[PDB]
Structures are given as structure tokens and as C-alpha cells.
Amino acid sequence: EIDKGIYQTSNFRVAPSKEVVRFPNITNLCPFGEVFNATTFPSVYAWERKRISNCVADYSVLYNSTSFSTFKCYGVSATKLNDLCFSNVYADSFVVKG
Amino acid sequence: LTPSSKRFQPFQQFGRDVSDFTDSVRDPKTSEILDISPCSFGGVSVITPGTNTSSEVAVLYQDVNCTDVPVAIHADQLTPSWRVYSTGNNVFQTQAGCLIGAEHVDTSYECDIPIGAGICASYHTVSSLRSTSQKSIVAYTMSLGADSSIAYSNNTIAIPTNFSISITTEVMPVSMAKTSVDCNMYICGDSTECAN
Amino acid sequence: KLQDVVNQNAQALNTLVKQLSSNFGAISSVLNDILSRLDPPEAEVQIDRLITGRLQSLQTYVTQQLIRAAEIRASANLAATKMSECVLGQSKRVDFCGKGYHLMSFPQAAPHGVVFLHVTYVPSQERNFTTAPAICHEGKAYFPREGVFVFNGTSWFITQRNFFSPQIITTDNTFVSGSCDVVIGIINNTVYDPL
Amino acid sequence: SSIAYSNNTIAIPTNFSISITTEVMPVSMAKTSVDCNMYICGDSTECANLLLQYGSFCTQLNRALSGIAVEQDRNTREVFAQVKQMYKTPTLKDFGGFNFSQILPDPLKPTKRSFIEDLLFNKVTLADAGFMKQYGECLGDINARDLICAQKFNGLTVLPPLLTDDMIAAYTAALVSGTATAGWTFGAGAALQIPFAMQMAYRFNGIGVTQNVLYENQKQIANQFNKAISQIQESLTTTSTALGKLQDVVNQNAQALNTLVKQLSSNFGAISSVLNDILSRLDPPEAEVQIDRLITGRLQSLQTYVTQQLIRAAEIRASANLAATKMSECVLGQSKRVDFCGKGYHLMSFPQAAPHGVVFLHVTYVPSQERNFTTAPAICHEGKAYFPREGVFVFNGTSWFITQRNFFSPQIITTDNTFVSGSCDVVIGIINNTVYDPL
Ligand SMILES: *[C@@H]1O[C@H](CO)[C@@H](O[C@@H]2O[C@H](CO)[C@@H](O[C@@H]3O[C@H](CO)[C@@H](O)[C@H](O)[C@@H]3O)[C@H](O)[C@H]2NC(C)=O)[C@H](O)[C@H]1NC(C)=O
Ligand SMILES: *[C@@H]1O[C@H](CO)[C@@H](O[C@@H]2O[C@H](CO)[C@@H](O)[C@H](O)[C@H]2NC(C)=O)[C@H](O)[C@H]1NC(C)=O
Ligand SMILES: *[C@@H]1O[C@H](CO)[C@@H](O[C@@H]2O[C@H](CO)[C@@H](O)[C@H](O)[C@H]2NC(C)=O)[C@H](O)[C@H]1NC(C)=O
Ligand SMILES: *[C@@H]1O[C@H](CO)[C@@H](O[C@@H]2O[C@H](CO)[C@@H](O)[C@H](O)[C@H]2NC(C)=O)[C@H](O)[C@H]1NC(C)=O
Ligand SMILES: *[C@@H]1O[C@H](CO)[C@@H](O[C@@H]2O[C@H](CO)[C@@H](O)[C@H](O)[C@H]2NC(C)=O)[C@H](O)[C@H]1NC(C)=O
Ligand SMILES: *[C@@H]1O[C@H](CO)[C@@H](O[C@@H]2O[C@H](CO)[C@@H](O)[C@H](O)[C@H]2NC(C)=O)[C@H](O)[C@H]1NC(C)=O
Numbered sequence: 011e012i013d014k015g016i017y018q019t020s021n022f023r024v025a026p027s028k029e030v031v032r033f034p035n036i037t038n039l040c041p042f043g044e045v046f047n048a049t050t051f052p053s054v055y056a057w058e059r060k061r062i063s064n065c066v067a068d069y070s071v072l073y074n075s076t077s078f079s080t081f082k083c084y085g086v087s088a089t090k091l092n093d094l095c096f097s098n099v100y101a102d103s104f105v106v107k108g
Numbered sequence: 109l110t111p112s113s114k115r116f117q118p119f120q121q122f123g124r125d126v127s128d129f130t131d132s133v134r135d136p137k138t139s140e141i142l143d144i145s146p147c148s149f150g151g152v153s154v155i156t157p158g159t160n161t162s163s164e165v166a167v168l169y170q171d172v173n174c175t176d177v178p179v180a181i182h183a184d185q186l187t188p189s190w191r192v193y194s195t196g197n198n199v200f201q202t203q204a205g206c207l208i209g210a211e212h213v214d215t216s217y218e219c220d221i222p223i224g225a226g227i228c229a230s231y232h233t234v235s236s237l238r239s240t241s242q243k244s245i246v247a248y249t250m251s252l253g254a255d256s257s258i259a260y261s262n263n264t265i266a267i268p269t270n271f272s273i274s275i276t277t278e279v280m281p282v283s284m285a286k287t288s289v290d291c292n293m294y295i296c297g298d299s300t301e302c303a304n
Numbered sequence: 305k306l307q308d309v310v311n312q313n314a315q316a317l318n319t320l321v322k323q324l325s326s327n328f329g330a331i332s333s334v335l336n337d338i339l340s341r342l343d344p345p346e347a348e349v350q351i352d353r354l355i356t357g358r359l360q361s362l363q364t365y366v367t368q369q370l371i372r373a374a375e376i377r378a379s380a381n382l383a384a385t386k387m388s389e390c391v392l393g394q395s396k397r398v399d400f401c402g403k404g405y406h407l408m409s410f411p412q413a414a415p416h417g418v419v420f421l422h423v424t425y426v427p428s429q430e431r432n433f434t435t436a437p438a439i440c441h442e443g444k445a446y447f448p449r450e451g452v453f454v455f456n457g458t459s460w461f462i463t464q465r466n467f468f469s470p471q472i473i474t475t476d477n478t479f480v481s482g483s484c485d486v487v488i489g490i491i492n493n494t495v496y497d498p499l
Numbered sequence: 500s501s502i503a504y505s506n507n508t509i510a511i512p513t514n515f516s517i518s519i520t521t522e523v524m525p526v527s528m529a530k531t532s533v534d535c536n537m538y539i540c541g542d543s544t545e546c547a548n549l550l551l552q553y554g555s556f557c558t559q560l561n562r563a564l565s566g567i568a569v570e571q572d573r574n575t576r577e578v579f580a581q582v583k584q585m586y587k588t589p590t591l592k593d594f595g596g597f598n599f600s601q602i603l604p605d606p607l608k609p610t611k612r613s614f615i616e617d618l619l620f621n622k623v624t625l626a627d628a629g630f631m632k633q634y635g636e637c638l639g640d641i642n643a644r645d646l647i648c649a650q651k652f653n654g655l656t657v658l659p660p661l662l663t664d665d666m667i668a669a670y671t672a673a674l675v676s677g678t679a680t681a682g683w684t685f686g687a688g689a690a691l692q693i694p695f696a697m698q699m700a701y702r703f704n705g706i707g708v709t710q711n712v713l714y715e716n717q718k719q720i721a722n723q724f725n726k727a728i729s730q731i732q733e734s735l736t737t738t739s740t741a742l743g744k745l746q747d748v749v750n751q752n753a754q755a756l757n758t759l760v761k762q763l764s765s766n767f768g769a770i771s772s773v774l775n776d777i778l779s780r781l782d783p784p785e786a787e788v789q790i791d792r793l794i795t796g797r798l799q800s801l802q803t804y805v806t807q808q809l810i811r812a813a814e815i816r817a818s819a820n821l822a823a824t825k826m827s828e829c830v831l832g833q834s835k836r837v838d839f840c841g842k843g844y845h846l847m848s849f850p851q852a853a854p855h856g857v858v859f860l861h862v863t864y865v866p867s868q869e870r871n872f873t874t875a876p877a878i879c880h881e882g883k884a885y886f887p888r889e890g891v892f893v894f895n896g897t898s899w900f901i902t903q904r905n906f907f908s909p910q911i912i913t914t915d916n917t918f919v920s921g922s923c924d925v926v927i928g929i930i931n932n933t934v935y936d937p938l
């Protein structure tokens with residue numbers, strides 16, 4: 011029930027119904043097989059940094075081959091990784107005891 | 109999303125203004141710069157004579173011309189009943205904005221509902237009175253006061269020959285309700301742990 | 305106005321009550337729910353969230369109350385001034401008590417307020433006349449004291465401004481100053497001398 | 500300053516000046532509205548749902564701001580719409596030699612305001628022109644972006660006043676015309692017509708000077724009035740800070756709105772000040788943690804803005820109540836309160852519209868060119884003491900006279916001039932002199 015007068019109203023009339031997604035066109039997927047499945051890995055003290063660029067990061071390719079006892083992401087959510095684009099990524103590799 | 113004239117640095121992907129609103133983006137596929145604008149342009153005000161009285165309303169759009177309202181409010185995405193208020197025959201332009209859904213009359217009345225910039229609205233009977241019982245929202249220019257003629261002359265005065273005793277009434281607040289709050293009851297009222 | 309004051313206070317108090325149902329980022333708005341579900345540490349996290357929210361809402365209420373009390377105090381100071389100047393006296397201030405010339409005033413109690421009945425004098429039924437600034441009698445200019453020279457159809461009279469009461473022009477009614485030349489619009493007429 | 504107190508010596512002015520001073524009073528401020536949902540979580544549905552959980556605060560904030568806006572319109576109506584009849588601007592603007600041309604609107608000018616009002620509206624810089632922006636004016640280049648577009652994109656808007664500047668100018672024109680033609684009478688009851696010279700004589704009586712002082716010196720008084728108005732116009736036309744208070748109100752409101760906008764860039768302990776960043780990076784639970792932090796911060800800043808606005812509106816309301824009292828007491832009447840209208844003895848007053856305010860031109864009578872005389876409390880004639888009525892005894896060089904206090908006009912001491920009370924012994928300083936008997 012409204013008394014007579016003029017009232018400012020918040021927007022309920024129009025809501026989005028379409029999604030427009032615009033990613034760079036990158037064909038090749040990131041070389042997970044080379045980084046994760048390599049014959050040798052460095053020591054902890056001599057740890058090696060590699061830069062990854064110009065690729066699509068699709069972790070599903072690992073599902074039938076790699077276990078990943080530990081997978082912990084800090085700045086971001088793991089469920090968000092498929093929807094994100096990164097300006098730069100580095101990969102540090104080494105071996106430690108459990 | 110609209111095309112933009114914003115000039116971007118060679119490698120910057122988006123632009124933001126002082127409030128950190130994302131003003132513009134660069135499309136990765138084509139490298140063009142697009143402006144991003146809020147879904148709701150600005151404030152809209154609904155004018156009603158009272159749900160008791162009627163279900164008719166008028167809409168006032170504050171910043172827009174009457175030509176630009178269907179684009180401003182995205183009429184193509186609204187319901188048809190909203191599109192009725194996007195464009196029509198009863199469209200009026202005020203300094204307050206564009207007012208749609210109110211009949212404009214050239215008679216000036218005392219202000220009833222203030223639209224602004226000298227324009228008021230009311231619920232008079234339609235001037236045509238074809239149905240003879242219909243009443244519409246009517247938009248008019250507010251009347252400031254009664255027109256009066258006073259004739260200035262030298263060597264002529266006006267002197268009252270009579271008087272009236274007038275008693276007027278003046279209502280003044282002097283007090284309000286004295287209220288007390290037991291904040292312990294308001295927050296953590298019966299909980300000892302919360303009280304600690 | 306009195307009803308507006310009542311409504312504002314009641315509405316503010318109702319809003320204060322309704323804010324308790326409002327969650328502030330806690331899991332629940334009911335304190336007992338988070339108390340019965342959660343162990344003391346995370347419970348203290350949620351309860352601190354609720355405490356901060358409710359303390360903020362209460363502070364909002366009290367600030368608005370201070371501002372409203374300031375408005376009411378200004379109104380009550382004006383009301384006391386009017387009781388002093390309109391009820392216990394006759395006010396020469398224009399429109400301070402009534403619209404017309406203030407005559408007297410009476411107070412009446414009202415819920416949380418006072419209603420002043422202002423009795424005023426309103427002149428009415430005006431008549432046009434021709435006037436003169438002064439009257440040149442013999443060689444001397446005559447100016448009215450407490451009046452205006454007015455031309456009735458037959459002869460010149462002097463009257464008070466607010467009420468038309470024509471009087472004969474005597475030496476007691478008007479005083480003498482200067483000469484006839486300086487005044488603009490002076491007219492020739494006799495001034496009655498009682499002696 | 501040195502003032503020499505003595506018994507039996509008085510100072511009496513032999514001359515006077517017509518003084519016109521100006522008083523600037525704010526009567527209103529900018530009516531602002533906030534779309535809370537646009538300000539916090541403006542385009543995000545998820546954030547909006549969280550905001551719904553947070554509370555009914557937005558309803559209360561909007562209620563406060565709308566109350567302020569309605570109060571602004573009430574302020575303007577109380578100050579200016581104090582006359583029920585809109586008296587027409589007289590064709591001839593010269594009454595008894597007094598020039599009302601600069602006060603009244605000019606038929607030839609396209610603007611309906613008067614000349615002085617034109618100067619006043621030029622003086623204030625902004626006058627809310629920048630705040631209003633049409634559709635499509637905000638899209639553009641990086642240099643084209645300004646703070647008003649940032650305010651628009653975030654839900655903060657400025658509402659136009661109900662009374663147009665032309666309507667306010669019409670009100671002030673009606674007031675000035677009613678004063679020129681009707682006098683003080685239109686303020687209470689019906690409007691009686693009076694020649695301007697006779698109304699001026701009535702004002703002079705109200706001050707305490709007799710009517711003949713006005714009528715004999717009419718040309719000088721008219722010239723002083725016209726010169727004072729010319730000086731007002733000249734002071735206004737050159738750059739000055741006479742209208743600094745109106746500009747201060749404008750600047751306070753603009754700065755408050757700008758601070759409100761800037762607070763959106765401020766982080767409140769969240770990972771980012773941009774809601775979309777944390778939405779696109781974090782999964783909904785920790786996203787809700789960060790978003791609740793941002794919601795609390797922005798809601799708090801909005802509440803701060805609204806509280807400061809309530810306090811400022813209270814100040815403006817007190818100012819507008821004072822302006823309405825002055826319009827009633829100085830414009831529709833002659834005020835006997837000291838320094839309420841003008842510095843001197845208040846004679847009359849005129850209203851002029853100014854951006855969000857009123858300017859009062861107070862015409863006052865200022866005594867000058869005083870002369871020292873010797874005085875007596877009373878005069879002992881035969882056995883009886885004589886006291887002046889409406890006068891003071893002064894010893895001119897030759898003989899004793901009686902004069903009015905504010906203007907030196909010596910008169911013969913007759914039995915009509917003075918009354919008799921008591922005997923000569925009681926009075927201290929009584930002097931022997933003859934009292935003329937007309938019979
Ligand atoms: C009452 O005020 C009005 C103002 O509207 C006076 O009328 C204006 O008087 C001035 C002065 O003569 C005129 O402007 C200037 O005149 C001089 C010549 O002295 C000339 O050199 C300038 O170029 C300019 O023309 C003006 O035309 C005239 N009218 C208006 C509408 O401004 C009036 O004189 C004053 N006194 C009265 C009416 O007794
Ligand atoms: C890691 O890489 C090695 C080397 O490519 C893989 O070993 C090969 O396994 C395939 C079976 O899929 C054989 O046909 C090749 O002969 C093997 N090559 C060598 C050099 O051993 C190994 O399977 C890879 N492991 C994973 C989990 O991908
Ligand atoms: C990414 O895709 C866009 C298409 O959206 C490519 O742009 C096209 O480029 C070709 C060759 O220059 C043109 O013929 C098309 O007209 C372009 N289309 C548009 C929409 O601009 C772009 O080249 C692609 N980038 C990469 C690296 O493959
Ligand atoms: C006194 O008489 C004068 C006329 O001599 C009246 O003035 C006229 O008033 C009417 C009223 O509508 C106007 O239409 C005319 O234009 C006026 N003409 C002139 C020459 O003044 C005046 O109104 C009378 N006053 C009263 C109180 O009756
Ligand atoms: C004002 O003028 C009128 C004439 O218009 C004077 O008329 C009086 O009229 C009555 C009855 O007609 C006579 O009995 C009086 O003797 C007249 N007065 C005279 C002749 O002086 C009236 O007196 C004048 N004065 C007023 C009204 O105060
Ligand atoms: C009152 O105003 C009238 C109207 O302007 C004045 O009458 C004019 O006076 C001049 C000067 O003698 C004459 O040239 C005109 O012919 C007169 N006009 C009319 C219609 O009579 C009158 O002088 C003024 N009275 C006073 C006392 O100033």
C-alpha cells in the first residue's frame with residue numbers, strides 16, 4: 011500500500027541474460043607432460059625456475075596419469091582456475107622427502 | 109558494452125576511474141577498446157496517486173531527453189508493460205527529466221505532488237471527460253500566487269473604514285518520547301558468554 | 305506536526321527492533337543457533353560479527369536521536385519565546401505571533417506540544433482618498449502629528465492610519481515647521497484655531 | 500577612541516546619511532539522492548543478495564536523504580512565498596525621486612531578474628550546473644571523464660529544486676513592488692496604497708525624527724538613496740567575497756560528494772577494492788568473506804556521509820528560519836530591534852534572490868556631524884520645574900532651546916513643548932529660564 015507522491019525506485023526492471031566471453035586465441039596447451047613427467051628433477055637447494063607462456067592451462071589432461079597428493083592454491087580458488095587468464099606464470103621444481 | 113574513443117597504452121588491458129569502476133576494456137581478439145556502462149543509467153521516480161485511489165502511475169527519468177529514454181532504459185529488454193512507459197502519447201519534457209504517463213494541462217494549480225523545476229502533478233479529472241468519470245495523472249506548472257493589481261499614484265491613499273477580529277492557531281512541538289535502551293538486553297541479552 | 309514527531313519516534317524504534325533479525329555476515333542472526341552449533345573459538349568469531357553489527361545499528365539510532373532532539377529543542381526555545389512575548393505581552397514584531405496586528409494570545413496544551421491562539425486586528429473595507437503631505441496656512445507649513453491629511457469630498461480632515469475617523473484640522477492636531485516653499489505637494493487650507 | 504564624559508554636556512547630530520548595507524543568507528543546499536544498491540554491489544547479483552541479508556540500512560539512509568530534500572524545498576518556500584498576492588511590477592520605477600530601477604526587473608532585458616540579481620547570480624561560480632549531465636555525456640575520452648560522471652555511475656545524483664530561479668525572482672519582484680506601492684500595510688491584511696514620500700515620512704517618525712525633516716530634505720535623501728544603490732551595484736560588479744557564504748555551502752556539498760566517490764577506491768581490509776576482482780578470483784565462501792568486508796566498509800562510509808548531511812541541513816535550516824524572520828520583520832515592517840536589519844536605525848529593506856540564498860538590502864538612517872551643547876535636566880520657571888516631552892534642553896550660544904535627540908532642530912520653550920511636575924528644589928542641575936506662554 012502506497013500513499014500518493016513521487017518515490018525514487020531502485021532498478022528491478024532489466025537484468026542480464028547473456029554472457030559474452032572473450033579470451034585470447036591460444037591454440038597449444040601448456041606442456042604439463044614435460045614439466046611434471048621429466049626423467050630428472052633438481053635438488054631443493056638447486057631449485058629450477060621455468061617460465062610458461064602462450065598456452066592453455068587445462069589440468070584435465072593430467073587426470074588419467076598423475077595423482078597429486080598435494081594440490082593447494084593460495085591467492086586464488088582451484089575451482090576458478092579454468093576461468094582465469096594470467097599475465098605471467100613461473101614453475102619452480104624440486105624434490106623433497108615426504 | 110559500446111564502442112569507445114578511449115586511447116589506451118600499447119599494453120594496458122582495461123581502464124578504471126577514480127572510484128575503481130572499470131570504465132573500459134580492450135577486446136583481446138580485435139584489440140578495440142570498448143566502454144563499459146552501468147546497467148541502470150540513473151534514477152527513476154514513480155508518481156502515484158495512492159494505491160487506495162488508483163493503479164495508474166507516471167515515470168520520471170531524471171537525466172534523459174524524451175527521445176532517448178527507450179535507449180536509456182533498454183526498452184527492448186523490458187516487459188511490454190514497461191515499454192508502455194518507455195514511449196507514448198503522454199510524453200512531457202521537464203528540466204527535471206522526461207515525464208511519461210501524465211497528461212500535460214496549461215492550467216496552473218497549487219502544487220500537489222512536486223515533480224521539480226516548477227512542475228507538479230495531480231489526479232484531476234481528464235479535461236475531455238469522454239467517460240465523464242475517468243481521472244488521470246495531470247502534470248502542470250505550479251501557480252505561485254494570486255494575481256493582484258495595486259495602483260500606485262501620488263496624492264492618493266487607502267484608509268480602512270472597518271476591522272475584523274481574527275484568531276489563528278499555531279501548533280508547536282515542545283517534547284518527544286524519552287527512550288531508554290538496556291544495551292545488554294539488546295545485544296547478548298540472556299547469554300553470559302556473549303556478555304563477557 | 306505533533307503526529308509527525310510521534311511517527312518518527314515510533315518508526316525509529318521499530319527499525320531498531322527489526323535490525324536484530326538482520327544478519328551481519330554471521331552464519332545466523334540468532335545468537336543461540338551459533339552458540340549451539342559451534343565450539344567457542346569460531347563461535348566467538350561469529351558472535352563478534354553479530355556484536356559489531358548490532359552495536360553499529362544502536363549507535364545509528366542514538367545519533368539520529370541526538371539530531372532530532374536538537375530540532376525539538378530549537379522548537380521548544382521558540383515556543384518559550386512566544387509564550388513570553390505573545391502571551392505575557394503585546395508583540396510589535398511583524399508576524400511573530402499572528403498575521404495581523406497582534407492583540408493578545410492564549411496557550412493551550414497539546415500532546416507533547418503547545419497551541420497558541422493569536423488574537424489579531426485586521427483592517428478591512430478600505431476607501432481611497434486624496435492626500436497632501438502638509439497644509440500651507442498663511443505663510444507656515446502644517447504637518448500632522450499621529451495622522452494623515454485626507455480629502456473627504458467636501459473638505460480636508462485628518463485621520464489616523466488604521467481606522468478612518470475624520471477630525472477637524474486644529475492647531476492642537478498639527479504642528480508647524482518651516483515654510484510652504486520647501487514641501488512638495490503642499491496644499492492651501494485653513495487650520496482651525498480653538499481660541 | 501577618546502570619548503569625553505562630562506555632566507551637563509550633550510552631543511546632538513546636525514546631519515544624517517542614508518546607508519544601504521547588504522546581508523547574505525543561505526536558505527538551501529543541494530538535494531542529493533543515493534541509490535545504495537548502485538553504490539555498493541552496483542551490478543553484481545551475488546553481492547546484492549548478500550546486501551539483502553545485511554539489513555534495512557539502505558531504506559533508512561534513503562529516508563534521511565529524502566527528508567533533507569523535502570526540507571530544502573520547505574526552506575525556500577518559507578523564506579520567499581510569504582505574500583499571497585503577486586503584485587505586478589509598476590511601469591514607472593521612480594517614486595518621489597527614489598530610483599527602483601536596479602531593484603526591479605527590467606522589461607527590455609530578456610532575463611526576468613533584476614540587475615542586482617544578475618550580478619549576484621554571476622558571483623557564485625557553480626550553481627549546480629556541473630552536477631546535471633544529460634544522457635550520453637559521460638562516454639568519451641580519458642580527459643573527458645570527470646568526477647560528476649563518477650558520481651552518476653555509482654548512484655549519487657542531485658535533484659533539482661522545486662522552485663525555479665525565475666519563480667524566486669518573481670517572488671522577490673512582488674515583494675519589492677508591494678513595498679514600493681503599498682508600504683508596510685500589505686504585510687498584514689489587505690494592501691493599502693500610499694505615496695512613497697508619505698511612507699518615508701512614516702518611517703522617519705518610526706525612527707524618532709519628525710516628518711518635516713523628510714519633507715524639507717527630500718531631494719538630498721533621494722540622491723543619497725540612489726547613490727547608495729549605485730555603490731552596492733559597483734561593489735558587486737567587481738570581484739569580491741560578499742557572497743562567500745553561498746560559495747562555502749556549494750563547496751562543502753561538492754567536497755562531501757567527491758569524498759563519497761573516492762571512498763570506493765579505498766580498501767577496507769579486503770584483498771581488493773574492486774568487487775569483480777575478488778569475485779573472479781575466489782570461490783563463493785571466501786568470496787563472501789571478502790565481499791562482506793567491502794560491504795561493511797562502504798555502508799559505513801555512506802552512513803558517515805548521511806550523518807554529516809543531517810548536521811549541515813540543521814545549520815541551513817536555522818539560517819533559513821532566520822532569513823524568514825528577517826523577511827517578516829525587516830521587509831514587511833520597520834524593526835525596532837537593534838542591529839537586526841541594518842547597523843543604523845532601520846528604515847526599510849529589500850529582498851534579492853541569490854543562488855541558494857537571499858540578499859537583504861537594508862536601508863538605515865545614520866546620524867552624523869554632531870555638535871556639543873550644554874544641557875539641563877529641567878528648567879525652573881517661577882516656582883515650578885519644567886521637563887521636556889519628546890525632547891532635550893540644549894543651550895545654544897544665545898539662549899536655551901528644546902530639540903529632538905537624533906536631529907538638531909532648535910525650538911522655542913513654550914508651555915506646549917514641556918510639561919510641569921514638582922518643584923525646583925528636588926531636581927539636580929535645574930537652571931533658571933523663562934518658559935514662553937503662547938497666550
Ligand atoms: C534610475 O536608474 C535608471 C537605470 O535603469 C537610469 O537610467 C539609465 O541612466 C543611465 C545614465 O544616463 C543611462 O546609461 C548611460 O548613460 C550615459 C549618459 O549619461 C551614457 O554615456 C552611457 O553610454 C549609457 O547610455 C541609461 O541609458 C539609462 N537607462 C537604463 C535603462 O539604464 C536613470 O537615469 C536613473 N534615474 C532616474 C530614473 O531618475
Ligand atoms: C613419462 O614419459 C615417459 C617417456 O616418454 C613415458 O614412458 C613411455 O611410455 C610409453 C607408454 O605410454 C611407452 O610407449 C614408451 O616407450 C615410454 N618411453 C620411455 C622412454 O620410457 C611415461 O609413460 C610417461 N609417464 C606418464 C605418466 O605420462
Ligand atoms: C584471434 O581471432 C580473431 C578473430 O576474432 C583474429 O582476427 C582475425 O584476423 C584475420 C587475419 O588477420 C582477419 O581476416 C579477420 O577479419 C580477423 N577477425 C576479427 C574479428 O578481427 C585474430 O587474428 C586471432 N588471433 C590469433 C593470434 O590467431
Ligand atoms: C480608488 O479609486 C481608484 C480610481 O480612482 C481605483 O484605482 C482603480 O482600481 C481598479 C480596480 O481593479 C483598477 O482596475 C484600475 O486600473 C485603477 N485605476 C486607477 C486610476 O487607479 C482604486 O482601486 C480605488 N481603491 C479602492 C480601495 O477602492
Ligand atoms: C464628508 O463629505 C460629506 C459629503 O460627501 C459630508 O456630508 C454630510 O452629510 C450629512 C448627510 O448628507 C449631513 O447631515 C452633514 O451635515 C454633511 N456634512 C457637512 C455638510 O459638513 C460629511 O460631513 C463630510 N465629513 C465626514 C464624513 O466626516
Ligand atoms: C502627481 O502626478 C501627476 C501625474 O503625473 C502630476 O500631474 C502632472 O503635473 C505636470 C507638472 O505640472 C504637468 O505637466 C502634467 O500635465 C500633469 N499631468 C496631469 C495628468 O495632470 C502631478 O503634478 C503630481 N503631483 C505632485 C504633487 O507631484
Ligand SMILES: *[C@@H]1O[C@H](CO)[C@@H](O[C@@H]2O[C@H](CO)[C@@H](O)[C@H](O)[C@H]2NC(C)=O)[C@H](O)[C@H]1NC(C)=O
Pocket residue numbers: 440490491492
Ligand atoms: C496658496 O495661496 C498662495 C497665496 O494666495 C498662492 O501664492 C500665490 O500664487 C500665485 C500664482 O502662483 C502668485 O501670483 C501669487 O503672487 C502668490 N502669492 C504669494 C504670497 O506667494 C499659492 O499659489 C496657493 N497655492 C496653491 C496650491 O494654489
Ligand SMILES: *[C@@H]1O[C@H](CO)[C@@H](O[C@@H]2O[C@H](CO)[C@@H](O)[C@H](O)[C@H]2NC(C)=O)[C@H](O)[C@H]1NC(C)=O
Pocket residue numbers: 173176633634635
Ligand atoms: C536534449 O535536448 C536538449 C535541448 O532541449 C539538447 O541541448 C541542445 O544540444 C545542442 C547540441 O549540443 C545545442 O546546440 C543546443 O544549444 C542545446 N540546447 C539547450 C537548450 O541546451 C541536448 O543536446 C539533448 N541531449 C541529447 C542527449 O540528445
Ligand SMILES: *[C@@H]1O[C@H](CO)[C@@H](O[C@@H]2O[C@H](CO)[C@@H](O)[C@H](O)[C@H]2NC(C)=O)[C@H](O)[C@H]1NC(C)=O
Pocket residue numbers: 513514515719722723
Ligand atoms: C547635511 O550633509 C549633506 C551632505 O554633505 C549636505 O548636502 C550637501 O549640501 C551641499 C550644499 O550645502 C551640496 O553642495 C552637496 O551637493 C550636498 N551633498 C549631498 C550628498 O547631497 C547638507 O547640506 C547637510 N545639511 C545640513 C542641514 O547640515
Ligand SMILES: *[C@@H]1O[C@H](CO)[C@@H](O[C@@H]2O[C@H](CO)[C@@H](O)[C@H](O)[C@H]2NC(C)=O)[C@H](O)[C@H]1NC(C)=O
Pocket residue numbers: 501503510869870871
Ligand atoms: C565638544 O567640546 C569639548 C570641549 O569642551 C570636546 O572635548 C574635547 O575633545 C577633544 C577631542 O579629541 C579631546 O582631545 C579633549 O580631551 C576633550 N576635552 C574636553 C574637556 O571635553 C568635545 O570633543 C566636543 N565634541 C564634539 C562633538 O566636537
Ligand SMILES: *[C@@H]1O[C@H](CO)[C@@H](O[C@@H]2O[C@H](CO)[C@@H](O)[C@H](O)[C@H]2NC(C)=O)[C@H](O)[C@H]1NC(C)=O
Pocket residue numbers: 895896897898909
Ligand atoms: C543660536 O545662537 C546664534 C548666535 O550664536 C543665534 O544667531 C542668529 O544669527 C543670525 C545671523 O548671525 C541672525 O540673523 C539671527 O537673528 C540670530 N538669532 C537671534 C539673534 O536670536 C541663533 O538665532 C540662535 N538660535 C538658533 C541657531 O536656532
Ligand SMILES: *[C@@H]1O[C@H](CO)[C@@H](O[C@@H]2O[C@H](CO)[C@@H](O)[C@H](O)[C@H]2NC(C)=O)[C@H](O)[C@H]1NC(C)=O
Pocket residue numbers: 506507927928
Ligand atoms: C558638573 O561637574 C562640575 C565639575 O566637577 C561641577 O563643578 C564643581 O562643583 C563643586 C560644587 O559646587 C565645586 O566645589 C567645584 O569647584 C566645581 N568645579 C568646577 C571646575 O567648577 C558642577 O557642580 C557639576 N554640575 C552639576 C549640575 O552637578
Ligand SMILES: *[C@@H]1O[C@H](CO)[C@@H](O[C@@H]2O[C@H](CO)[C@@H](O)[C@H](O)[C@H]2NC(C)=O)[C@H](O)[C@H]1NC(C)=O
Pocket residue numbers: 879929930931
Ligand atoms: C533662580 O532664581 C531663584 C529666585 O531668584 C534663585 O533663588 C534665590 O537664590 C538666592 C541665592 O541662593 C537666595 O538668596 C534667594 O533667597 C533665592 N530665592 C528664592 C525665592 O529661593 C535661584 O538661586 C536661581 N537659580 C540659579 C541656578 O541661579
Ligand SMILES: *[C@@H]1O[C@H](CO)[C@@H](O)[C@H](O)[C@H]1NC(C)=O
Pocket residue numbers: 160161
Ligand atoms: C481506499 O480503500 C477503502 C477501503 O478500505 C475505500 O473505502 C476507499 O474509498 C478507498 N479510497 C479511494 C477509493 O480513494
